[PDB]
Paper text:
Nck proteins are composed of three N-terminal SH3 domains and a single C-terminal SH2 domain (reviewed in Ref. 3). Nck recruitment is required for complete T cell activation, and its inhibition dampens TCR signaling by reducing Zap70 phosphorylation. The objective of the present study was to initiate development of an inhibitor of the Nck/TCR interaction, specifically by blocking binding of the first SH3 domain in Nck (Nck1-SH3.1) to the PRS in the CD3ϵ subunit of the TCR. During our studies, it became clear that Nck-SH3.1 exhibits conformational diversity and can swap half the number of its residues to form a dimer.
During the crystallization efforts that led to the monomeric apo- and peptide-bound Nck1-SH3.1 crystal structures, seven more structures were determined that all exhibited domain swaps, leading to dimers. Dimers are formed by exchange of the C-terminal 25 residues, almost half of the entire SH3 domain. The interface thus generated contains a short anti-parallel β-sheet encompassing the CD3ϵ sequence 36KSWW39. Indeed, the hinge region varies over ∼6 Å within the superposed ensemble, and the distal loop covers a distance of ∼8 Å in the dimers. Given the large number of swapped, independent chains present in different crystal forms and grown under different conditions, swapping seems an intrinsic property of this SH3 domain.
Author numbering:
A (entry chain A): 3 to 56
B (entry chain B): 0 to 57
Amino acid sequence: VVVVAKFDYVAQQEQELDIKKNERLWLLDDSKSWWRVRNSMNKTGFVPSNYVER
Amino acid sequence: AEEVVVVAKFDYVAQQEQELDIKKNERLWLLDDSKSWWRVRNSMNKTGFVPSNYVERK
């Protein structure tokens, strides 16, 4: 699935991707949602949203 | 402030440095809550995460 950047996104962490408006992007996992989480040793990263519950 | 404690349903093995290894039943803090991210690749074959509202299927 090719998608298109609607707007500029300036990465606010080294863990995010910078994209330019109109940029052609390849959407990689059947458009699955990821969430950003932090563990008890203060490490942060993305996990697929379906792997956690409140 | 907007950080809720969530529990891992399953083990997850990180496939990129920006992802996080987690264990089933591990307690984690969910950040930027409401914020759904998509894993994308650009024309320079860099893969990374962007907020879902910044992209669309045309």
